[PDB]
Ligand binder design. Structure first.
Ligand SMILES: Nc1nc2c(ncn2[C@@H]2O[C@H](COP(=O)(O)O)[C@@H](O)[C@H]2O)c(=O)[nH]1
Ligand SMILES: Nc1nc2c(ncn2[C@@H]2O[C@H](COP(=O)(O)O)[C@@H](O)[C@H]2O)c(=O)[nH]1
Ligand SMILES: Nc1nc2c(ncn2[C@@H]2O[C@H](COP(=O)(O)O)[C@@H](O)[C@H]2O)c(=O)[nH]1
Ligand SMILES: [Cl-]
Ligand SMILES: [Cl-]
Lengths: 488, 487, 488, 488
């Protein structure tokens, strides 16, 4: 077993003063991975004052000095990629085949990206007249808070802290109570790279206490939240009631995958598989509404079933395992409730629909890869994000119809189209009300590419140059060199 | 005047609320007009009208949109005086202000954004020979603006100009105190060729019409200007309902720092313009004036001399430069703060009472008021008054004044008066405010982003960035290589 | 006959002091349109001193004051579009069906575009440390010169003067001696719009004198030239040798049009026609090397023959005329020599190849629309810009081959591909060495879109936000607020 | 002495086929440092073909892969700083106190800066209408050539190669024949960092042969030149006559230092010293015209004499040496000619004016720190760049006068003002016709700050984000999804 996990405040581990702890479970076995201390209201106050002190040191350094420190953190993350991925697999249940290739690789890609952009962060200068001009400064916000989710723990920590730190802020990061372990490791790595004490503090805890204490704190200038749509609305409200914080939200979706009448169905089946069953379906951007032309539906169903049969659940550290248990046993219960609603509302179950059983599965939170067909737009499984391995296949007749049905949702995160035709690909994508659109692919999220939701799926964006800027605030300065005229 | 209706889809329409309210002329106490209030059903009609207009509007070319907004600018320039007189009647601000500032600078911002529409561009990012990303800056759709009463038509233009320029339709709710010019603007936009529904105006009260807007599920963004308390309610309800993007321009308690090397005639002029324009009803006003102790007595003399030249009177008279407050309930709140200053030991330098006599007894007048000997714990020093109440505070050294200038939950504006190169930039760089003026006050060019730090605001208005903030980024990856599935 | 045309200097017409004149001819009839004064060395020096004085007034105005004046000029151009187009047709020989729909419309579009961008022209601000920061100004160059070509006289005058003026400069414009008339009209329009005197001066003359005097003048900060590749090299040399001027050059090309194996051949033929025979083939961006798959070549040739048979030469003011004479008898002589070279080098003449004869044609320099096929990469007509209505059709077998052959040229101006396939369209275009690339279209040049040549086809760009910036020069300013340390 | 120095082509040293060599002299002793092979016409052609091959590999890599390789070159340069600085001191005669603190540090600072910006290099996307859009690519130019100067050999090589490589190009670099050695070392360092073979080739040689072969080559797309005004005009002409290359030129200046009437004269004297005597006056940006108010002139002259007496010439490797010989004996002869010109025209010699003599100086190309006063705007030493340690002090009476005199020159490189007054500093700087402006300082050139000349002092800029973009060329691509309409 691991040692009791403490808070990370001001460059060292420190005991919480809340007197409270929680446990994180290994979802493959049900065993306790670690007991974790929970940050109380006073621990949060201590973290903010640590962050205020560190942020001043960090911002006073030169831009290239900050760049070099983050680059050293990148180097450590590349060296420790396999070790960090193994820890992430234990905490999340995701196969090592995923965590060692994606989670830290792409988290570090984003930190590496923003490290190089720090010196390009510039204000503007605006001439008004010969005797007066304006210039702007992109100043740090100060202390910002990141609230992470459990499906990509260290990647989310990196995607939130990289731009925040790169812009000259300190960040207090609260990982999900489900998956707190890699965030604490990241804090140690940042310190090892030379990040000033206090610039990245980590506070494990539960949302109702530690999360709320951060969102309410008067000296936190911005909150960045990743999680479910409902919890997001609550976070965003509480941030306004306290001190009118800036907000960023990356929430869930019900993203449509549109298969065009001229699509190759093997390619379409491969994209739908990767859009539904990666990380056991626990991805906010998953293409869980798969729209297929009626004339191709039966053949598409056959190709999905063939690929589903190739899914390899088992030992999460085995090279050939590509499917894991869900992150927790309560989450499995929620996915199973959705599956039962699909059955009772008349969707046709093509495969899966139950837990996995037998040696090596009975103690883990496993759900079989599940595919429903003959789905309709009013069904619960079609309208609501499930966050488990459940694909809904929907038939359609014409392009105008599928665009309307694709857009007829409160969600807005991602979308995609499969077509070899130039006009159809751009024409359709331009009409879809989603922030992340994939043509003949799914899932790739380059550090350069801003990502976030339309409508109820988000506020603001992550990644790209714009996100570095969104972690600064503009100060406009007018220099008046002419004589000032008063009307009094 | 005739009973004022809602403006929905290019025409005046009766409200379905069965409710009305009155707007009072603050100079006479008389009712200017009865105004229909938009109910929950009216808001839904406005949204559906806005959805229809926005699609027509967004389908036009960028230059087609530019030309239509430019035509609205031409109409606003022509009707500057007519609109200003209506603004004066509704707000109590002197015609000397409304005819020179309110429509002029409102139109300036609309004109600025009209020209930037064709420059609104996405990006393209190569990943590898076989895949690239490009982005679109798409309209949000239907957005809502909630205006304040101190600059009714200017606020309406500063919100609607970037929103319309970005391809959105806007539903605008003016303050119930000052609803009249927003309705005039709606007619002007239509006359310019704005498609029906792209700018709808829904007068009403904040507790009903404003709340219905913040709650509507099909509104993508709310832009609010007003007080801090009302703002927190707006931003909460916008999140609880449909997770709207939000922009907030709130009040402040902005510091004016007079340096030890400042010319005191210049410093006094800046302090005057920072406190008594629009009778002190300006969000950015420099209501905490920090003066070095060694010059405090002389500065107080120079302020008193200039206060003596203030000309209250007929708001349509050329030489009038001071008006009544926007309403009698607001005057009562301002008087509550003034009495707080007296009881907490601040020294009254001038004013502090209502104005009396022929032509003033019927208006909501408060005399220009100056407190000195102020300390950082006083209520008048800590809280926004939004009336003509200057607070003068003494200081000894530069480090102190910076700490005290920043020791506030507000973050809107700030300024320094000094002829020294290093001092001006050095001090300004350390102040926690979004709008900083050196050797001046109040100028807000269309090019210059403005908004608050800390409790004074969220987001910005004006400048290129605000046009972008009325769009949403769509990222599109083109994968020309063979897609690899691990299953 | 028109009245004698004078120089335009400092807001009024003025006699040249050179004592020299030239005539501009109506290319449809041979009649003298007007006698035109030629600017001498002293006239250029007067124009520069006028421009220097006007530029200071212009640059001192507010940004929106400049914007409003250029917009008034736009409004005048819209109102007089048909009158100016008729003058352009008389001077150039291009059909009114073209000049009234393109030349002034698109010239004014660019002026309107830049008029609106003036307030967005901004510098930068760069923090170095707490005690020092840098800011930049985008200052006007001062006095710049534009040298126009004869195929699009007023359009070029607008595309050069609009960004130059919007950036705060004065421009001295030298129109082609072939086509000086609309530039003089534009100068009056600017003044009527409120442009300060001296900000746009126009100096007709011949290239060997007036053009050379401008390129040599020591107080002209930049030369922008449109013309042939050969003449361009001469101008760029003289500008460097005299005073080290900044330079922009829009030269000719031999642009490839690649027809993919999956293209609809009616669409491909329509694009090829528009890419070769608009303005009687006198267009720098024309797609004069048409690459067609071997298996479709015969059918494509038939479709070209059918469309060529529809070309309607005749009265240039008639609605149905869509083909005009070449601008002059010397230019037709050169085109005729290229046609004869094609015949003698073994290319197969598909149609045309001769002068037009008979009533209405004997007085103009008309050449029949000409198409050569069976062309090979070594032929003179394939390698060299003809600037007449001469299409070369080349067969190809595979995609790698056609990209190689398309790129095997010193020219670099434009290119295009015809294909409905998403991957093919972007994949091919990304490999073509040209600045202006069209997918399933040809010729459109939006004000927003920077256009210019690779390799020998140009230096710099016109249109787009970047061209406004390129008519400014960057000044960097460091404010050092810390104590300066000397090592001596 | 060193072994015969070879060319660097395609990742290795290779013997030249020209049969020609030249020698580089140690300016402190007159000894031959090394015999160096000169690249011939055939050698330039091999280098270009090597560069074309390397550039294709380099450009095909990911952006972050290119960033990492340039960052490894940075790390090696930091490590080998002292070794490289000693070599630079031997080759240039600049004191080790300079070369070890400035030359490699600031060269590497720029490489490090551009390494981080590679992922931020983005094109644009422009919607035209629902059925058509434009997007742009910032493509590499291909093979570019940089031609270096002798005063900052490795710094110039880094400032040219860093943006060029970061933008995806290969560069062929020709160092000055006076100082060829550190460029060859840089070529090895790049390869050691993982730069693909051919991406950075170094061709020592003379300007009239090797330099000309580069400017003439048809497959080099851009020339970047740093040197004198005269040779620049020659280079820019030959580049146009051959293949219409893009050009950047960083030439000399006669930059003014304006001392305001409210300036502290100790600060002004310190700024004037650093603006004139660093690198023994061999800096293009030097403030060689020092304008002082008449009322302060006598006191300022005394303060200059005091500080000139503190200059410590001697052993270039001694810690306390801060002044060196000139780069070569022929260059000293030209500097002496300028000094005699000052005497013959009646300028008053305040100090210096002769060679240094005695043990340790008789064998080196030493010139004493020289200050002329009572200078006027028509004097040769005032009008012409000397590129030696020669300060000219000019009296003035009022602000308008000094701005006019500061600007009355063909040069435009730098300028500066000394004043504590807010309005005066910005007011004056905004009116000066120079690209590089310093307030209350001199000489600092941050990687973020674009630098280059107005008027005859240059074309284009170096450093800053704009210089990364200027090493790409814009390709505009229109996607037309609507039906194309032909008028034929
Ligand atoms: N998008 C998203 N949804 C989540 C996440 N965690 C839980 N959910 C969703 O929220 C609900 C349960 O959340 P809980 O109340 O257990 O935190 C379920 O609908 C579940 O799918 C998360 O990290 N991201
Ligand atoms: N690209 C281009 N070529 C031109 C232009 N004017 C003339 N030429 C070319 O120059 C040659 C003869 O014209 P000249 O410039 O000698 O009068 C021919 O090759 C002709 O096509 C022009 O404006 N653009
Ligand atoms: N600005 C500048 N001038 C130079 C440079 N090298 C030589 N010069 C100047 O050019 C002239 C000729 O010197 P040369 O080029 O033959 O060494 C002299 O006035 C010399 O000072 C250089 O690298 N930069
Ligand atoms: Cl491990
Ligand atoms: Cl009236």
């Amino acid at each position: 077993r691991m040692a009791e996990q403490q808070l990370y405040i001001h460059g060292k581990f420190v005991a919480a003063t809340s007197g409270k702890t929680f446990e994180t479970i290994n979802p493959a076995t049900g065993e306790v991975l670690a007991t974790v201390q929970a940050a109380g209201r006073e621990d949060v106050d201590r973290a903010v004052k640590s962050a205020q002190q560190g942020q001043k040191v960090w911002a006073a350094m030169s831009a290239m000095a900050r760049s070099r420190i983050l680059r050293k953190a990148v180097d450590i993350l590349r060296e420790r990629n396999d070790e960090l991925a193994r820890l992430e697999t234990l905490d999340t249940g995701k196969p090592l085949s995923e965590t060692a290739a994606v989670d830290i690789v792409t988290g570090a890609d984003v930190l590496e990206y923003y490290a190089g952009l720090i010196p390009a962060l510039e204000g503007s200068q605006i001439p008004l007249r010969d005797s007066s001009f304006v210039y702007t400064r992109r100043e740090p916000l100060g202390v910002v808070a990141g609230i992470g989710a459990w499906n990509y723990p260290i990647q989310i920590a990196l995607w939130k802290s990289a731009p925040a730190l790169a812009a000259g802020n300190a960040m207090i990061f609260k990982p999900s109570e489900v998956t707190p372990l890699t965030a604490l490791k990241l804090a140690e790595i940042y310190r090892e790279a030379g990040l000033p004490d206090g610039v990245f503090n980590v506070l494990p805890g539960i949302g109702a206490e530690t999360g709320q204490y951060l969102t309410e704190h008067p000296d936190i200038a911005k909150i960045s939240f990743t999680g479910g749509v409902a919890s997001g609305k609550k976070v965003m409200a509480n941030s306004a009631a306290s001190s009118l914080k800036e907000v960023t939200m990356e929430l869930g979706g019900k993203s449509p995958l549109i298969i065009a009448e001229d699509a190759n169905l093997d390619l379409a089946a491969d994209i739908a598989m990767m859009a539904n069953f990666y990380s056991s379906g626990q991805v906010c951007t998953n293409g869980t509404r798969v729209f297929v032309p009626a004339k191709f539906k039966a053949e598409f169903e056959h190709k999905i079933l063939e690929r589903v049969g190739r899914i390899r659940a088992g030992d999460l550290f085995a090279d050939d395992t590509n499917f894991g248990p869900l992150v927790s046993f309560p989450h499995r219960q929620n996915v199973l409730r959705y599956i039962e609603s699909g059955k009772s509302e008349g969707a046709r179950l093509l495969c899966g629909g139950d837990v996995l059983k037998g040696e090596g599965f009975d103690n883990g939170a496993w759900v079989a890869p599940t595919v429903f067909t003959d789905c309709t737009d009013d069904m619960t499984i079609v309208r609501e994000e499930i966050f488990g391995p459940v694909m809904s296949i929907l038939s359609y007749d014409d392009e105008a119809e599928v665009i309307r049905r694709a857009n007829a949702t409160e969600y807005g995160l991602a979308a995609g189209v499969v077509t070899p035709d130039l006009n159809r690909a751009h024409r359709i994508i331009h009409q879809l009300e989603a922030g992340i659109c994939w043509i003949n692919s799914w899932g790739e999220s380059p550090a350069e590419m801003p990502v976030g939701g339309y409508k109820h799926s988000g506020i603001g964006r992550e990644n790209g140059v714009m996100t570095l800027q969104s972690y600064t605030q503009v100060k406009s300065i007018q220099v008046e060199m002419g004589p000032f005229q008063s009307i009094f």
